């Protein structure tokens, strides 16, 4: 079950969907854009709560290693 390049690319592609400006972090705005693509209508505060759940380093936004937590949710 060793990590594959296929999986790594899947993780990077998924991160990039959210991180649309390529700056390496997912903001509330970026997360909101993906939520709205899914027909959802979260508020800024709700988006911040979503980020808070995985924002290990407390900088208020999602980086790539934090995003992996999301990929692991069942
Ligand atoms: Ca970004
Ligand atoms: Ca963070």
């Amino acid at each position: 079950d060793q990590l594959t390049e296929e999986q790594i690319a899947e993780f990077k592609e998924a991160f990039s969907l959210f991180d649309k400006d390529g700056d390496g972090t997912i903001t509330t705005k970026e997360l909101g854009t993906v939520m709205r693509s899914l027909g959802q209508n979260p508020t800024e505060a709700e988006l911040q709560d979503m980020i808070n759940e995985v924002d290990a380093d407390g900088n208020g936004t999602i980086d790539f290693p934090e995003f992996l937590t999301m990929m692991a949710r069942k």
Side-chain angles (χ1 to χ4, degrees), residues 15 18-27 29-30 61-62:
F15 190 74
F18 290 84
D19 179 26
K20 285 181 179 60
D21 66 2
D23 85 326
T25 211
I26 303 165
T27 59
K29 41 199 153 143
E30 280 169 332
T61 63
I62 306 168

Side-chain angles (χ1 to χ4, degrees), residues 3-49:
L3 180 65
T4 68
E5 287 278 4
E6 175 175 3
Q7 286 179 285
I8 293 172
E10 287 169 8
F11 302 154
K12 298 184 162 173
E13 289 169 11
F15 190 74
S16 287
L17 172 60
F18 290 84
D19 179 26
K20 285 181 179 60
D21 66 2
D23 85 326
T25 211
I26 303 165
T27 59
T28 52
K29 41 199 153 143
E30 280 169 332
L31 183 55
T33 295
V34 172
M35 289 283 283
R36 289 191 298 274
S37 83
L38 287 160
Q40 312 303 134
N41 188 207
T43 62
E44 174 71 7
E46 279 177 296
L47 291 163
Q48 190 55 243
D49 283 330

